[PDB]
């Protein structure tokens, strides 16, 4: 597609350090500061059952797929205005390619 596909292994250590403190990946996993990311791709925004989101993450209504996530992870607070995801963004496109290739095989 537009986005390519980095190494799934470089993408693991990216999450372990930059995202695991607020989000969880496995099936039925517990919601922390952020949602349980399982089954995130193909799913509309603001729809992880049992999480009380902002009406910004809900009314945005996008279908999560590899390309729009790259446009979100670059600068999150610009893509979804008013979100409570306290995070600046990943500026290097290679590190954004590594992380998404890990997440699409993890949240299957």
């Amino acid at each position: 597609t537009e986005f390519k596909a980095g190494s799934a292994k470089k993408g693991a250590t990216l999450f372990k350090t930059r995202c695991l403190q607020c989000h969880t990946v496995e099936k039925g996993g517990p919601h922390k500061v952020g949602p349980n990311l399982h089954g995130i791709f193909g799913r509309h925004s603001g729809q992880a059952e049992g999480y009380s989101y902002t009406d910004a993450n809900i009314k945005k209504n996008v279908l999560w797929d590899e390309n729009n996530m790259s446009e979100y992870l670059t600068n999150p607070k610009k893509y979804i205005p008013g979100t409570k995801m306290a995070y600046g963004g990943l500026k290097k496109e290679k590190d954004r390619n590594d992380l998404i290739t890990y997440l699409k095989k993890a949240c299957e």
Partner: protein
Amino acid sequence: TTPLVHVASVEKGRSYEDFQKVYNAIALKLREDDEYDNYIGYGPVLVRLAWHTSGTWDKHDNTGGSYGGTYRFKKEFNDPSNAGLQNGFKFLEPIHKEFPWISSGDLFSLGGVTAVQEMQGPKIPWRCGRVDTPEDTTPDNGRLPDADKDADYVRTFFQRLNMNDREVVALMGAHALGKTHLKNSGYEGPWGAANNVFTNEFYLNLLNEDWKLEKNDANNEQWDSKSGYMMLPTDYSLIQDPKYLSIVKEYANDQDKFFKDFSKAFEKLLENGITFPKDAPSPFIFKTLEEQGL
């Protein structure tokens, strides 16, 4: 031995639907000239215009305020703290040639109202009748605030505009919009990431970021974060002060409460000093472009 009682008088036979069209006009030009200031838009500078022409007010002697529309008169236009607004004027003037009947004040105020709503903010009620007053009642400069100070200053400076704790924290949240320019006021960097959409971001950045004090390329000190965001010493005072912080904590957790508090506060900041008639019209709550099918 009285302050000046400014009586509001409506423009010769005009109602809601006419002002609705003035709203719709300036909202269309807002939409179209989206290139401005590296894609932020003319929105955030119209609110700053609607505030800097209402923040001239003093309660003790009714001088300043948004009535006479005294931004057009040279004295005010070239005030150091008023630098940058010229763009907001340049934007508004082709609409003052489309609507020559409308008063200068009624336009600056409506300028800021049509900016917030369009940026998906609260539906801020608005009253009309800001009749133009002569150039001799143009207020001497320095009546706006200085950013380099602290908490106690922001409490006592805003005491003159007749705004309380809850009310100033609400008004401060408009900093979620646009950015600070080093050319104008000598400070650089945005407060948030969504500059062109009005949200409760100003508060969520205020406490969820790790801030460190630094000096800029104008030899002024300001609070910066590694995400590229920024806060004034007056914006950062909102969390230093224990009473101010409880309200910042509330609006960060409840955005609908901020919206309701911002509408009540912003409209009151705009109405300061004006005594409304008693056979005068009930306030207008204009509908947005999204709602009107355009």
